[model samples]
Target: HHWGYGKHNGPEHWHKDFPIAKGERQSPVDIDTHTAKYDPSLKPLSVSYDQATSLRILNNGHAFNVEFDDSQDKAVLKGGPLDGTYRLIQFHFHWGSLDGQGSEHTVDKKKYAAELHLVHWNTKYGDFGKAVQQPDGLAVLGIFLKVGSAKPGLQKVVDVLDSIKTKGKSADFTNFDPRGLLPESLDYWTYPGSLTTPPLLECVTWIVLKEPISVSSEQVLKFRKLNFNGEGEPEELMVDNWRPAQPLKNRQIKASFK
Candidate 1:
């Protein structure tokens, strides 16, 4: 009832509670490759993930999140546009009820079937909550998902959907390397933007991969089966949980490759 994807409380009405919804640096902006600048200076992204650090998978009502133990330096992200090591905190996805749509960030006005978000926090900031308030505190790696042969690594995540189908449900999930979910090419578009969700802090440094990972249509449908309602409540499918692309305003997107 507070904030949701319904006609009464959806994104269009978010500005009433979160004024930053109208802020200059909001996220999920359309990526126009023609206007993006190719910067040779951008470093290759360095990612390190320890399967043992994987904790649990939870259906947080908004999306399914696979969390990691970020208290240590085990799983970290460096290089690219990041100034320091950022600890892996969690990863989640956004999708539509129907295919051919749902990715938060689009390129050339094209929407993919789904999108993956690997959320991380700057180690310098100590914790994710504290980091979200700082300008350079968060770095989210976005990977697009297209309909194709199912990815083996992604199947591991899909295998657990049934266990956490409802909101507030969580199950133990470990020894899974998130890097397996990444595409072959590390080339990406970098920009400064805010979180696509509430509180919508203008702190995240977005690195959206150019190459999309493949997922079969069957697997994509599995995501839609998840429920926004909890165990005792009336069931409602969790789909189209993505925020629409915001105005580009004065920001510029830098490409790591031409």
Candidate 2:
């Protein structure tokens, strides 16, 4: 279990929670829509799970940055499920400042308090930078969080948050399939969107899962239990870290439920 920026505290207080938070790029921020031009010809392709891939996990205290080995073949995407091969790259998450509400993507402006982003690259062509230039270069899987019944899936990870409670502390967890945490259904809402960060590339094809996974109040509180200010001082807590939703920007957000 990690405790630095994301898992234990929200991003706002992350820097104080850990010095590394100052250097890293945090998510769920305003996207510069005017600066990001769009292209229509570029579409996504399908990917099969068989492609050779490598997934490495870095415990970075805040959240685990799971990087995939994409130097090889690309993962194929089908129009049925998606549009094109989006090579797996890295996946991370966002949480509330105090574990109640801080997520970026909301349902009708209804905040979930936290969200997780499983980011992928369009492998049908090249890497992220080059792909970001095109329309179908990226695929992001978004999962929302709420304060409700406890979800079994979250228990596996929460059990380990203690060891890495401090800033800059990390460990290597192996042979774990990040996909295991995915919601049982594949149905999602799709849209033409940009990264939730600076240079907010407009190359993203967002697939936000329709259903939310549950987390207990106890589990959510774990996020507020972390400290990064020196040991001798009062523990700096992680509180609100969500960026308000950006303008729809004349962008079409389509739900797959239809």
Candidate 3:
């Protein structure tokens, strides 16, 4: 069976099943801004989202994801440390039950109420399956979500959660602009990392935004209500669906802004 957030099946137990969990480039590393070196050579990132490509939102037994139709370059990310464009596949989130320690990546020990992940794949590999086998296969864009005034973009996403409260549940969620959820600026700190979950492949180029978008605490509360358990299983809150920060190891973080 796959891993989960429970004490018996969580991150610490992950390395047992997926030895790469202790890999050199493990993800969700704590970003110590004081040591983050400025790199003027990094260009501005380009993001293009074709709203028509948004497919649906589903609880995938891990987190609720809004997947996209990645058959074409309908939604793609380019520039800013990328060799070519990476096509958008899906987006998901991680949050805490108490709104204090949900974010996977931290800024000098500061944790946001939640975190957002935008998964993209390198088209050079032809498909996600083949892409993961390459060193430069994935480029994941991450955003911190703080508890504050409501964001209209996030509100639209939260409403569908009520219908998809259990694992494997899904609902149509199209026309949502992924760009609407971004911060005003694209200033980011990037480094080599892996997926935060099991089979945590070290194929990601982590691009985490310096600025955070706001969402109401109530919106986070709604996410907490989602059950990690399926319809017939015992109800377990989906809160703390995040992996803690891993060691930075020999890697260094590069900041696009000075």
Candidate 4:
């Protein structure tokens, strides 16, 4: 494979092939909430999703992605540090080998059990692939996951894990409203960053929510059952698919709520 979470190809060695991996505005930074500037002018986020736009779920080796049909503006994110509407394309998750340390981003040095990323592309830049290379081309909403009560809304997604347990496995999934997975508060921190994966382009405007959604330990364990290998390959657990936090540099993190 070109890149992966293996010791030989993980994030630490990514810069050898992708120079921008060391770029100044890289993502998954530690969010020091106390130092984040509270911007009153930031508008409340506007998110609208159409269940019909949800397509299928896939295990892409790196992570499990819930793809969306973004051919039209059926699902979109606007306001809250965005200059225009960005179409929702897909969502994925990153977790650790065990609970309490999986999230890519952290708050005041505390890591969560996992993290959910809602990926979007700036319509102004055409499609997602094209948007990935532009400075203001992508917008990703990050939500932290805590170990607590089972999330009823997420059960629908969890129920399908067995179907896509191995890499390249996929299943039809629709009529799912992503909003149900969100936390009660929309309060978030915004900053310019990049994708936390290979080709690490510095083109994302990250909006990381302050509040986290609850998921029971059982629900969290389901993610660990996923495999990074195909049927014929040596089975490898897909846990800890997250990239470590990069340097903050001189970037200013703006908060939507005080």
- By lDDT, the best candidate is 1
Those runs of model 2 whose alpha carbons end farther than 4 Å from true positions after fitting are: 1-56, 59-63, 72-81, 98-100, 226-235
Clashes of 4: 1
Worst 10 residues of 1 by lDDT: 46-55
Best-first order by lDDT: 1, 4, 3, 2
lDDT of 1 by residue, 57-79 (tens): 99999999999998889888899
TM-score of each: 0.98, 0.68, 0.98, 0.98
Tens digit per residue, CA lDDT, model 3, 47-160? 887543888999988899998999998999889988898999999999988878899999999999999999999999999988887779999999999999988888889988
For each predicted model, how many residue pairs clash, with residues at least 3 apart or on different chains?
0, 19, 0, 1
Q: Cα deviation in Å at residue 128, candidate 1? A: 0.7
**Tens-digit per-residue lDDT, 130-213, candidate 2:** 987776778788887777888676664555556445555544543445555566665566666766643455667776776777
Candidate 3 accuracy as lDDT: 0.91
What is the Cα root-mean-square deviation between model 2 and the actual structure?
A: 7.4
Model 4 TM-score, 2 decimals: 0.98
Provide the overall lDDT of each model, using Cα atoms, as 2-decimal numbers.
0.93, 0.58, 0.91, 0.92
Between candidates 1 and 2, the one scoring higher on TM-score is 1
Clashing pairs in 1: none
lDDT of 1: 0.93
